[PDB]
Design a protein around this ligand. Sequence first.
Ligand code: MOO
Length: 226
Amino acid sequence: SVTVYAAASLTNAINDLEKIYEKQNKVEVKTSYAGSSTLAKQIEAGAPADIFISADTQWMDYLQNKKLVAANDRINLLGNRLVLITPKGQSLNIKLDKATDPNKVFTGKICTGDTKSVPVGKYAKQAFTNLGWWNRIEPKLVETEDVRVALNFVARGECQVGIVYATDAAISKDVKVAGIFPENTHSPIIYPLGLIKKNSNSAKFYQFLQSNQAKAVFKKYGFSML
Ligand code: MOO
């Protein structure tokens, strides 16, 4: 068997590839999804993950610095974009530009991941700072421990808007995109793939995630191949 810990934004793609790999190999693939921060900390505490996929470089560096992944056993796999979402039926179009006043466009709460630890929230905080919006945005936040909890809060109408990845908006018929953050507002969204346990089964799955077959699933879900 092989145990894969993956950022919550990767739930649907990795579930699809788990099914494909189990049809092609006599190996069992076990998956665990959560915020990249939670998963890295769990690995640090001894969780038996063979493979880790983070939604930012920071949480893979965190493991590298603890010597839990080698520089040569990680690769940048996927990219994404950062988006604003609204519940379906409460559509908006908001330009993510310093000229926009967040106090006039955001008249309720704003749902995203914890801005200090969950990658989606860290990317969001970079963007708000670059836009000069941080001190007006912070009082509006509801912070969650992964991007999918935030997505669900928006789908259920507990927040007027949310900040999730483009791939999250596309997976949910209950939310719609209200704005795309320009790339120059934040660090590039990069998913490093890391081989944590070096054994025969884990190495095959690590390679499989880079394969032509895996590229097609990731592209289906809206990710970019790096
Ligand atoms: O680690 Mo996530 O995909 O930003 O919740």
